Tab-separated table of C-alpha atoms and ligand atoms in Angstrom:
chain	number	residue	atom	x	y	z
A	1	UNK	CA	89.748	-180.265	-11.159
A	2	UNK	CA	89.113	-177.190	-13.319
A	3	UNK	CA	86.840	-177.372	-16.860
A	4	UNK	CA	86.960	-174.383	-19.006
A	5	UNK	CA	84.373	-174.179	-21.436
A	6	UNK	CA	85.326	-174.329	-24.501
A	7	UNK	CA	83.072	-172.554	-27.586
A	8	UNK	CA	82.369	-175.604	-30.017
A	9	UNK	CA	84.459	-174.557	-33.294
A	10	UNK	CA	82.925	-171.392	-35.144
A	11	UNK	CA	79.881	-171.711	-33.659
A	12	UNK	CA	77.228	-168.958	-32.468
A	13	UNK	CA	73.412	-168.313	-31.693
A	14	UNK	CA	72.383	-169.176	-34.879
A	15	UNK	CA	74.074	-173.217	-34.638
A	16	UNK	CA	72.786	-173.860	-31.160
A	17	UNK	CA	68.908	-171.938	-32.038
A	18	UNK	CA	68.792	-174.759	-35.170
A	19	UNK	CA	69.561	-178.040	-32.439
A	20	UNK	CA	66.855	-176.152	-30.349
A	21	UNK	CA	64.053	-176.141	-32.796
A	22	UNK	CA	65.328	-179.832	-34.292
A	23	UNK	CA	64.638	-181.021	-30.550
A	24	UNK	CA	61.581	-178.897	-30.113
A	25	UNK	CA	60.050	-180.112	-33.504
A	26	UNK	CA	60.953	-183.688	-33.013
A	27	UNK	CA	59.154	-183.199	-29.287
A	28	UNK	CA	55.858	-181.917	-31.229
A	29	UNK	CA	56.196	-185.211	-33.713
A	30	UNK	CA	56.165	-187.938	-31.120
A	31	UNK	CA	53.269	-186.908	-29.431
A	32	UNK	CA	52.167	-190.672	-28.192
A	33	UNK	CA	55.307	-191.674	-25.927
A	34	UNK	CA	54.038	-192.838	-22.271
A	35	UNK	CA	50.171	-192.402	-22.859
A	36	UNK	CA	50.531	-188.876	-25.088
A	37	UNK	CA	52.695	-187.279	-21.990
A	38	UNK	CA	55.138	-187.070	-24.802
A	39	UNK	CA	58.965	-186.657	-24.151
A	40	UNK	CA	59.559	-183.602	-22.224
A	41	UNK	CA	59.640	-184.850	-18.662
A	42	UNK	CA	62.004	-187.381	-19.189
A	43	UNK	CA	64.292	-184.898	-21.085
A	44	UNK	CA	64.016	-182.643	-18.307
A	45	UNK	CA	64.746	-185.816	-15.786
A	46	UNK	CA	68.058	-186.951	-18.135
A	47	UNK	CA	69.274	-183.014	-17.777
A	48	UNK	CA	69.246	-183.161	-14.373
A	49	UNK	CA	70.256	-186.526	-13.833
A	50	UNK	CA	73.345	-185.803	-15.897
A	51	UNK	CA	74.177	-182.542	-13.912
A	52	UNK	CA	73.147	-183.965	-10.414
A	53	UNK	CA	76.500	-186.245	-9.892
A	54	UNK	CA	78.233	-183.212	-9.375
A	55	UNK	CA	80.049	-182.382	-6.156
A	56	UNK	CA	81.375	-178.990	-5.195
A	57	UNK	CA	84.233	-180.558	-3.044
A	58	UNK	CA	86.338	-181.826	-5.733
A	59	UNK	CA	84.453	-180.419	-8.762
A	60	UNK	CA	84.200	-184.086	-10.193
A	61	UNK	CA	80.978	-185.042	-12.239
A	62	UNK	CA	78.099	-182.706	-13.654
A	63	UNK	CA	77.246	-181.729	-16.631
A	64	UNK	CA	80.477	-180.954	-18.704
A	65	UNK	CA	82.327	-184.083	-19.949
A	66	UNK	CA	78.693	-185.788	-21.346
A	67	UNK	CA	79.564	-189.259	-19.466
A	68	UNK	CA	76.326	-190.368	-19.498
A	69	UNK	CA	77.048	-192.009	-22.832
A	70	UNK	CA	79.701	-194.243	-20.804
A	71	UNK	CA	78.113	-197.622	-19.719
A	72	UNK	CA	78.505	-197.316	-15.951
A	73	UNK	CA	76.260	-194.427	-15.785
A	74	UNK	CA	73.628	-195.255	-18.478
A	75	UNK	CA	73.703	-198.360	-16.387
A	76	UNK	CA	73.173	-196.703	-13.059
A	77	UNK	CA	69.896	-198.039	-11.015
A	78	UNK	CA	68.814	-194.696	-10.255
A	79	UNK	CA	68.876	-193.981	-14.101
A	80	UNK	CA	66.706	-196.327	-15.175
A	81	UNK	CA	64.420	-195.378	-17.477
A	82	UNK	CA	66.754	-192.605	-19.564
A	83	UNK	CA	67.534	-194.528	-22.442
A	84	UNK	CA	64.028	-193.442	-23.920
A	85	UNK	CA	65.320	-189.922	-23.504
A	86	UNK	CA	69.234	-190.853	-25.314
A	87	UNK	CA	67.002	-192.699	-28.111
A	88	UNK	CA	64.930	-189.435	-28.820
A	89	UNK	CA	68.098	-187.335	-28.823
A	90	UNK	CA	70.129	-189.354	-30.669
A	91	UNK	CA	68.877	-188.499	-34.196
A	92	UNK	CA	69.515	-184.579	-33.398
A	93	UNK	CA	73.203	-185.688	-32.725
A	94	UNK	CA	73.520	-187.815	-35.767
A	95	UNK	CA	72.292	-184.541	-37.320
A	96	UNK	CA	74.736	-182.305	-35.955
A	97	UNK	CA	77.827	-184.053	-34.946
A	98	UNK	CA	79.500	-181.048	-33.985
A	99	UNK	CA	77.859	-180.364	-30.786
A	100	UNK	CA	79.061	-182.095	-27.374
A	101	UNK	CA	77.105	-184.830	-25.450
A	102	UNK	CA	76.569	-182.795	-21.976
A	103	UNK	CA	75.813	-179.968	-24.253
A	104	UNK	CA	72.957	-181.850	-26.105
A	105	UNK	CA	71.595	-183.332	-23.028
A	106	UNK	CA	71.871	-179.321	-20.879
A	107	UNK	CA	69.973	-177.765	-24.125
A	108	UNK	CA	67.350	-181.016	-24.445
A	109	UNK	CA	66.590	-180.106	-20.835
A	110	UNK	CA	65.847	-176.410	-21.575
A	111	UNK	CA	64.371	-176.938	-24.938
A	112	UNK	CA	61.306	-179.002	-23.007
A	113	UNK	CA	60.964	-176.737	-20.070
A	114	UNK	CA	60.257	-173.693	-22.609
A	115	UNK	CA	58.342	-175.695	-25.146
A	116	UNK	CA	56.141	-177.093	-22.216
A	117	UNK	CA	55.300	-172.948	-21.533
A	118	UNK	CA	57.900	-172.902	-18.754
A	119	UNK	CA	60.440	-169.736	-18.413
A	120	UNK	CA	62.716	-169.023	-20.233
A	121	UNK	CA	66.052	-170.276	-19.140
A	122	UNK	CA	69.525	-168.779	-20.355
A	123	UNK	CA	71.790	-171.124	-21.418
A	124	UNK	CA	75.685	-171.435	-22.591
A	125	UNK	CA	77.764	-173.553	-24.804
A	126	UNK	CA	80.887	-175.351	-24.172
A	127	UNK	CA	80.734	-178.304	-22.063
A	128	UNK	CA	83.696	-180.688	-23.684
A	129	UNK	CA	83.314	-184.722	-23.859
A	130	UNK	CA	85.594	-186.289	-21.555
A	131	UNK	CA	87.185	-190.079	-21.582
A	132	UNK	CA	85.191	-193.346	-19.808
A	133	UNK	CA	87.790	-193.016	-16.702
A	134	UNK	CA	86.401	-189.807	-15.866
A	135	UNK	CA	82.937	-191.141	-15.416
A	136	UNK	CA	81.639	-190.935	-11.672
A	137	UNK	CA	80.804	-194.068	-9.666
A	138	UNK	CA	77.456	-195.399	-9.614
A	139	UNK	CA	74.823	-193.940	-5.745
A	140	UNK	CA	75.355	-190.049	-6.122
A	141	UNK	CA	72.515	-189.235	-7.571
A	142	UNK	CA	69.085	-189.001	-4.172
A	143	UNK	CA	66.777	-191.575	-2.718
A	144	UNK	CA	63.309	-191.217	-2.662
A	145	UNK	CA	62.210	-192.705	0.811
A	146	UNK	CA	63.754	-189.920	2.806
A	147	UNK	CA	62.690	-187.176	5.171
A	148	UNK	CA	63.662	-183.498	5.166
A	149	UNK	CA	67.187	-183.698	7.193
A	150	UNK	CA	68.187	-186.002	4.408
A	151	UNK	CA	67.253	-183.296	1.143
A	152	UNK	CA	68.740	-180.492	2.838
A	153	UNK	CA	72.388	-181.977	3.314
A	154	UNK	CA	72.192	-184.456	-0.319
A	155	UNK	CA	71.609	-180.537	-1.860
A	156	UNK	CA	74.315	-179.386	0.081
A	157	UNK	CA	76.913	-181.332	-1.988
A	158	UNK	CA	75.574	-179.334	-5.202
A	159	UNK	CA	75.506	-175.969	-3.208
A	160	UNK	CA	71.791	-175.495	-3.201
A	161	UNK	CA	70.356	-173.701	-0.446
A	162	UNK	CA	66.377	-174.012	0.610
A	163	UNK	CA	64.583	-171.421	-2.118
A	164	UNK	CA	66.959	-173.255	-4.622
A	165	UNK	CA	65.881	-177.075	-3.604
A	166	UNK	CA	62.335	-176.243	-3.149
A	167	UNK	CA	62.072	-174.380	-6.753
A	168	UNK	CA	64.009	-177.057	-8.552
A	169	UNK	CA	61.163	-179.666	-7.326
A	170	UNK	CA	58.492	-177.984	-8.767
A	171	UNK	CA	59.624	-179.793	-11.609
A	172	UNK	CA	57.651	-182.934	-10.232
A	173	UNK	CA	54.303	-181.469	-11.474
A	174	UNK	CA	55.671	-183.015	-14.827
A	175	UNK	CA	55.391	-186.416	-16.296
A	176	UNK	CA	55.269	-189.604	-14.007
A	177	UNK	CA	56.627	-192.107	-11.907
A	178	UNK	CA	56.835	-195.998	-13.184
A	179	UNK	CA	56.554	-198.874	-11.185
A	180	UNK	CA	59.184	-200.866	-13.328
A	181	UNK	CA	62.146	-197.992	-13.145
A	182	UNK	CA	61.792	-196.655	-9.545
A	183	UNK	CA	59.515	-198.579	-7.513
A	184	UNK	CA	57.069	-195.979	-7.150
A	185	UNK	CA	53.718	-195.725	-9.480
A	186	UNK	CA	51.286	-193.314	-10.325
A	187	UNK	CA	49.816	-190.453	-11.653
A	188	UNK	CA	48.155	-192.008	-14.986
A	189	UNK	CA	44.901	-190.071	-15.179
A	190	UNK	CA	46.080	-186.363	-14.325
A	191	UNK	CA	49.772	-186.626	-14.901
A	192	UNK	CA	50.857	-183.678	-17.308
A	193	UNK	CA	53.298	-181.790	-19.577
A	194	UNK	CA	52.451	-178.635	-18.995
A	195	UNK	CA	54.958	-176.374	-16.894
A	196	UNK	CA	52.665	-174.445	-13.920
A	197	UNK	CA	53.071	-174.247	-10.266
A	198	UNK	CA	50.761	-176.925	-9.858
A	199	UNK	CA	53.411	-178.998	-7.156
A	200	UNK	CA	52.934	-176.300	-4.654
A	201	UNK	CA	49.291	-176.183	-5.265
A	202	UNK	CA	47.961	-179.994	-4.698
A	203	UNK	CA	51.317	-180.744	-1.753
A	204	UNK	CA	48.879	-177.681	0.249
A	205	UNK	CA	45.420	-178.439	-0.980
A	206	UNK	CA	44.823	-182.222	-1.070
A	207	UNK	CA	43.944	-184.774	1.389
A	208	UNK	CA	47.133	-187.357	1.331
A	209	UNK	CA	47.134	-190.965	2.103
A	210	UNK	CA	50.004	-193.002	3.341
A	211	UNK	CA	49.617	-196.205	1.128
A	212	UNK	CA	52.224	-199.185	-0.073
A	213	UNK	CA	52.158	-199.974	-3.727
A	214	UNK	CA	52.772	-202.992	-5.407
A	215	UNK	CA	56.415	-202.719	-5.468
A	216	UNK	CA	55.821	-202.455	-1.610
A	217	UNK	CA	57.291	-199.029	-0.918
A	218	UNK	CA	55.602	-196.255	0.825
A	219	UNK	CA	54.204	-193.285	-1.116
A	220	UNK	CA	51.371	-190.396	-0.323
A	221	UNK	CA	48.151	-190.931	-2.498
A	222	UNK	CA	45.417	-188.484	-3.371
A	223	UNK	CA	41.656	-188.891	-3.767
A	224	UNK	CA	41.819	-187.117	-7.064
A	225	UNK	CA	44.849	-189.617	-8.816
A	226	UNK	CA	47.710	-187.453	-7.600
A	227	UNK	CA	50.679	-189.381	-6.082
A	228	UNK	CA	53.383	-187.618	-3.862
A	229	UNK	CA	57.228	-189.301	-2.978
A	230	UNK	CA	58.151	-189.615	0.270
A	231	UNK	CA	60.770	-186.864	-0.216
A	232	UNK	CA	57.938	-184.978	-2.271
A	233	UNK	CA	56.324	-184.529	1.231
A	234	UNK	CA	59.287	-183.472	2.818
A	235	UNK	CA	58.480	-180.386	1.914
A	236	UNK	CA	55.528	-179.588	3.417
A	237	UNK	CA	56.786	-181.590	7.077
A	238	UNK	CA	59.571	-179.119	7.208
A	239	UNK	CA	59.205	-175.253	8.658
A	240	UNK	CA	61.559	-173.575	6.432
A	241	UNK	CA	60.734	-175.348	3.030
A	242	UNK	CA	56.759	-175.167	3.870
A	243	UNK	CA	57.263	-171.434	3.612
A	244	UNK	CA	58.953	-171.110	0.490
A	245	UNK	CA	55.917	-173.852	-0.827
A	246	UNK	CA	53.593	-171.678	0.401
A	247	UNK	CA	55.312	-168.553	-1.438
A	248	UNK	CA	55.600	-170.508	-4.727
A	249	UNK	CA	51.628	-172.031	-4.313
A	250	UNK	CA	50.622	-168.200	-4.318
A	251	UNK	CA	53.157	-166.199	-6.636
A	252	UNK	CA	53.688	-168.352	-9.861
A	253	UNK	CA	56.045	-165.223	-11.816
A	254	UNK	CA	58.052	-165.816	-8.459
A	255	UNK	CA	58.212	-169.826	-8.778
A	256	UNK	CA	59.051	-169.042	-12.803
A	257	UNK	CA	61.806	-166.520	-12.145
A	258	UNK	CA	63.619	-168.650	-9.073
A	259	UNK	CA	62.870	-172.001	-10.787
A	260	UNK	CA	64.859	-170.372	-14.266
A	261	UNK	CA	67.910	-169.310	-12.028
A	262	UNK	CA	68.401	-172.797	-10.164
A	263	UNK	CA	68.045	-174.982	-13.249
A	264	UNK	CA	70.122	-172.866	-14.867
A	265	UNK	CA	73.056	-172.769	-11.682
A	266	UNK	CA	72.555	-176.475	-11.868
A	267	UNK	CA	73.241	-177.109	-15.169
A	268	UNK	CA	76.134	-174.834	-15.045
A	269	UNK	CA	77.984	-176.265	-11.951
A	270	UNK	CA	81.644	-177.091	-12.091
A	271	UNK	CA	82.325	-175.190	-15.545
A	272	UNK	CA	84.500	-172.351	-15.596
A	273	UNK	CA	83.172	-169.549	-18.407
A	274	UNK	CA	86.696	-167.499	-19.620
A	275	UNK	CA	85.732	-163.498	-19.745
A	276	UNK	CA	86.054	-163.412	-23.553
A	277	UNK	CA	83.454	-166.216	-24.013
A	278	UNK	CA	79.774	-165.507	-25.179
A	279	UNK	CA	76.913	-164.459	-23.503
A	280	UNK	CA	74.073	-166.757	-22.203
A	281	UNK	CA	71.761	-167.499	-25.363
A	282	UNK	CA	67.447	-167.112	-24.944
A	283	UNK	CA	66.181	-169.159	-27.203
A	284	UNK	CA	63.230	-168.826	-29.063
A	285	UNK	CA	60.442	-171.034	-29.017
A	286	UNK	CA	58.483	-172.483	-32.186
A	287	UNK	CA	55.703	-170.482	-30.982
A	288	UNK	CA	57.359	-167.141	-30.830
A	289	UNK	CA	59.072	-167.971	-34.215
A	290	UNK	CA	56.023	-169.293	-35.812
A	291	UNK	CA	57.109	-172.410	-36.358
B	1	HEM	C1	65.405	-185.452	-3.791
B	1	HEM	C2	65.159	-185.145	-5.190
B	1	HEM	C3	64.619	-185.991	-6.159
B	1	HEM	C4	64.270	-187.350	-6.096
B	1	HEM	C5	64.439	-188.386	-4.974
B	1	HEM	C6	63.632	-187.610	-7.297
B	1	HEM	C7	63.018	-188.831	-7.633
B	1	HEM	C8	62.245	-189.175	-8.759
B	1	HEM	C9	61.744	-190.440	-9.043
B	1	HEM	C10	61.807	-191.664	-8.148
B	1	HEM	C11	61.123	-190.329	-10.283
B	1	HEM	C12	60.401	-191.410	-11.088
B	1	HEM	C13	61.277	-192.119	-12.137
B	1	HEM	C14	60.516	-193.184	-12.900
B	1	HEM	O1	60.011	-194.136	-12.321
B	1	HEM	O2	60.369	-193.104	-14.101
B	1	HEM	C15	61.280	-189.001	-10.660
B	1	HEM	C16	60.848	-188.464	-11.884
B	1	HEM	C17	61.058	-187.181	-12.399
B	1	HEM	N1	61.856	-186.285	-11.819
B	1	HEM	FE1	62.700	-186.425	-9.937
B	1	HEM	N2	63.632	-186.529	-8.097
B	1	HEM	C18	64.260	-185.557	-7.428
B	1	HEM	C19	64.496	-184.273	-7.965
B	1	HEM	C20	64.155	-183.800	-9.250
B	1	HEM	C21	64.515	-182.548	-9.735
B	1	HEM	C22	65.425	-181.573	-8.980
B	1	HEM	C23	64.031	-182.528	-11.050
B	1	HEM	C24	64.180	-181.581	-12.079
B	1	HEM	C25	64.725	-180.239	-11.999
B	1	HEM	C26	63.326	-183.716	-11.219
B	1	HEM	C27	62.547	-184.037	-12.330
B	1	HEM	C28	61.826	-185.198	-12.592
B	1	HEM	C29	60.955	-185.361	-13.665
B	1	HEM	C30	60.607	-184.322	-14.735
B	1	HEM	C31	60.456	-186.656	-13.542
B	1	HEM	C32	59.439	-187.336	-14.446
B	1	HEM	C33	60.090	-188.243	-15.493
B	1	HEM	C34	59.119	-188.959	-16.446
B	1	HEM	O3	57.958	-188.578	-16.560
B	1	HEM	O4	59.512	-189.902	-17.128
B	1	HEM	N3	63.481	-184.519	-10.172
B	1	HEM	N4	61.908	-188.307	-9.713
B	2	BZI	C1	57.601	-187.531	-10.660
B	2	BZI	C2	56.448	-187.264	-11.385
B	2	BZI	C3	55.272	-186.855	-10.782
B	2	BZI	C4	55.284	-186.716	-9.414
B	2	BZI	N1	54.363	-186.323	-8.521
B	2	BZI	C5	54.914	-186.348	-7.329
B	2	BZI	N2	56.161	-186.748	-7.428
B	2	BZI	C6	56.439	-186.981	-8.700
B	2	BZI	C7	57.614	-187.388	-9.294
């Protein structure tokens, strides 16, 4: 299976820059969403989602055909929950038509990482909509009861090694989990939208419980309000991963940097990029334009 990218007709920097700041000013508008956390977790959560059915053995899902909008996968169990983030973005595709569905859901991704004062992450165009019979099957994307063994070889499949897991779940400092779509609850109190290397910080530094919630699965509790998945914890029970945690919790330009260059490789997986197509775009954020 091979997917060139293909440059949406005519388009350039300035096209994609205007979807940006229509996502990034429609993310500054509806503020109240899930107790004022606002939509850019679950943005972030649909753009990986959307990219994490890939497998490298026979390059089928990811992020390129946009066949989320198919009903098997918006139906998925493990992607309950997502339709709040297809009913924010679909507006911005109603107002421009012209740009593909796994590119709208990639750029919705990176527009809330850099809006929530994350890095910066390079991005390119092209991903092209495929037909409903190319949609995967339902049970690739992870579990959440799991130990270490079991994130190391699911990762595998998407060709992430350690330093690339363990910066890619940094991105559980954001937003929240919700008893009715996952079976897991909590935070509520200190649950945020603000993109630090916070994860690292409170997996080292606070004193976790081992309680069952009401849906009656397992999860690590906090004195303070903080909650932790079992495969959250993971990372600290493991030798390898607790050093790269422990390199994260005390370098946060590191954890920035590595974080930007794994969200980007996973967004990009299974696309081939021809030699004559355009550079990765940086987008600017409202702040930086003054908007
Ligand atoms: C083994 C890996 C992972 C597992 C098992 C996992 C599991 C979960 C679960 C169970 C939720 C709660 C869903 C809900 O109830 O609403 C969640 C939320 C979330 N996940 Fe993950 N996740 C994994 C990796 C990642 C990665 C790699 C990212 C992003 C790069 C990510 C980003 C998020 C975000 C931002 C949320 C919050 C969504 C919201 O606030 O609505 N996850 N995760
Ligand atoms: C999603 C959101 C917040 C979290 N804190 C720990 N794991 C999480 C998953």
């Amino acid at each position: 299976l091979v997917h060139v990218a293909s440059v949406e007709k005519g388009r350039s920097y300035e096209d994609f820059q205007k979807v940006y700041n229509a996502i990034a000013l429609k993310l500054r508008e509806d503020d109240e969403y899930d107790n004022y956390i606002g939509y850019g977790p679950v943005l972030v959560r649909l753009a990986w989602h959307i990219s994490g059915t890939w497998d490298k053995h026979d390059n089928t899902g990811g992020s390129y055909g946009g066949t989320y909008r198919f009903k098997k996968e918006f139906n998925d169990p493990s992607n309950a929950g997502l339709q709040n983030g297809f009913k924010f973005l679909e507006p911005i595709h109603k107002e421009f038509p012209w740009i593909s569905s796994g590119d709208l859901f990639s750029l919705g991704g990176v527009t809330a990482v850099q809006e929530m004062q994350g890095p910066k992450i390079p991005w390119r165009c092209g991903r092209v909509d495929t037909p409903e019979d190319t949609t995967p099957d339902n049970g690739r994307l992870p579990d959440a009861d799991k130990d270490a063994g079991y994130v190391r070889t699911f990762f595998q499949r998407l060709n992430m090694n350690d330093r690339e897991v363990v910066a890619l779940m940094g991105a559980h400092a954001l937003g929240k989990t919700h008893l009715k779509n996952s079976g897991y609850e909590g935070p509520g109190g200190a649950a945020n939208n603000v993109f630090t290397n916070e994860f690292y910080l409170n997996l080292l530094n606070e004193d976790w419980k081992l309680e069952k919630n009401d849906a009656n699965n397992e999860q690590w509790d906090s004195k303070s309000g903080y909650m932790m998945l079992p495969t959250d914890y993971s990372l600290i029970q493991d030798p390898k991963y607790l050093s790269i945690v422990k390199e994260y919790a005390n370098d946060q330009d590191k954890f920035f940097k590595d974080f930007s260059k794994a969200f980007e490789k996973l967004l990009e997986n299974g696309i081939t990029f021809p030699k004559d197509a355009p550079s990765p775009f940086i987008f600017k954020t409202l702040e930086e334009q003054g908007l």
